[PDB]
């Protein structure tokens, strides 16, 4: 298994500043950070058809930095930005504002409670946040798994997920942020030359990979879901290993392809939920077998 | 009511080597697949591949739609459809002759399968001749984990049981899928008859109300069988069916497809222990179902 963390550029409800805040985490299974700094119960990562379409889109044209010889976020950021600009992924004048934002405080659950929650925000050409124009709303994950404050069976069952992170594993950080001056969604993927522990992550697991998903507020794209797909992709072994072994973007893309090719889609059905989802078992079992070819 | 859908494919019978359409699967909410032996497999929930859906969406968006078409024969539908394809630039004037004859080839069913010994994957040649696909063929997942039951064991003709669920006043849908390596791109034709007319092409005399004609060249990321399954599965979904009957343009059909996709749950590859499945595979399934029926006058029926 592996530990993956998802953080989003947000505006804190209190001071109204602009920080990064943890939204979900994986250790195979996924957990969602509630509005009150309380973790949602673990669950299987289901993804929207859209997030996989977009991920495939944005990755096929992604900026890839393999064996980046950096051990800091500032070091990675400066580098990722130089490649972005270079690949015409972003404009030269966006750099100063994007670096500054990427280097903000990367808050975690424990701070959420003190800050009095956090709000959705959009980075501007001045560095000031701005509420997104297009209508905002709590995700399915929050609506479904975030109605606790304390786990029903046990107020700390969610913490039990952390009990599954392997003795010698590495982590992945997925950063999701919106900037109004950006012309389109961009995907940045980095593999550190040597695993480095970053102060941006919740727990001290050495970081090996980073996904940076940035873009302007566009009507047909949900960045939280794009993030969840990226993280869920990294949480899959066959991919994770291809990610360790790839020597170019194409090898990663070829792997994303198998992941997609082995994903199962269960359209809207009125059939009895348990049987409806117990039906996937024999099918999934085969696709799972095909992935491991 | 629960529309009976049948999916047929342009195929080549092993013995005679002739071309013809052979029934591949049928739906009455649940899906069954025709085993290579002419034997129906168990009815199951339709699970679709991400690619069959992306392709269905791409083709539906540029789809040739004929609503309330005043025709009562497959041939009558074919001529109109082909004339519409050409006008909308889905096919060339030179491709009509070959595509019409093809659409009008024999439409065989399971019983015929046994008699023919079997059929083999085919591609329509520019000269109307059958040809083996260029890309290496393979057994579909459905034919693998469902079909091989046809022998009559502790349940004789149990899959027939699905036929028991066809409503007393239901209309059907025909999904025809075929590869013509001379077409320049895949194309989708969607037809809604002014009046449901029964057609010999269908296994059962249920009045055909809709048709999906998906034709094209062998292209990457495009399994025509799976694309067929996606269209037939879309039709079998209550909210889309009701939109398909109300639609007065392609837009309404596409809006419904959007909703179908929004409410679809993609379950990525991973080690499958039932306990770990249900957690999302229950409350999430419920939410997507609830969202799907939110604006539709339909009602979920287990």
UniProtKB/Swiss-Prot annotation, chain A:
Residue ranges, annotated region (Dimerization arm): 249-293
Cytoplasmic-side positions: 1-293
UniProt modification remark: N-glycosylated.
Subcellular localization: Cell membrane; Basolateral cell membrane
Variant or mutagenesis effect after changing residue 30 to A/R: Impairs expression at the cell membrane
Effect of residue 35 to K: In SPH4; Cape Town
Effect of residue 1 to E: In Di(a)/Memphis-II antigen
Region (Interaction with ANK1): 121-130
Organs and tissues of expression: Detected in erythrocytes (at protein level).
Residue span of region Globular: 1-235
Disulfide bonds: none
Described purpose of this protein according to its UniProt entry: Functions both as a transporter that mediates electroneutral anion exchange across the cell membrane and as a structural protein. Component of the ankyrin-1 complex of the erythrocyte membrane; required for normal flexibility and stability of the erythrocyte membrane and for normal erythrocyte shape via the interactions of its cytoplasmic domain with cytoskeletal proteins, glycolytic enzymes, and hemoglobin. Functions as a transporter that mediates the 1:1 exchange of inorganic anions across the erythrocyte membrane.
Subunit note: A dimer in solution, but in its membrane environment, it exists primarily as a mixture of dimers and tetramers and spans the membrane asymmetrically. Component of the ankyrin-1 complex in the erythrocyte, composed of ANK1, RHCE, RHAG, SLC4A1, EPB42, GYPA, GYPB and AQP1. Interacts with STOM; this interaction positively regulates SLC4A1 activity. Interacts with GYPA; a GYPA monomer is bound at each end of the SLC4A1 dimer forming a heterotetramer. Three SLC4A1 dimers (Band 3-I, Band 3-II and Band 3-III) participates in the ankyrin-1 complex.
Pathology linked to this chain's protein: Ovalocytosis, Southeast Asian: An autosomal dominant hematologic disorder characterized by ovalocytic erythrocytes that are rigid and exhibit reduced expression of many erythrocyte antigens. Clinical manifestations include mild hemolysis, intermittent jaundice and gallstones. However, the disorder is most often asymptomatic.
Family under the similarity heading: Belongs to the anion exchanger (TC 2.A.31) family.
The protein's name in its UniProt record: Band 3 anion transport protein
Organism from which the protein derives: Homo sapiens
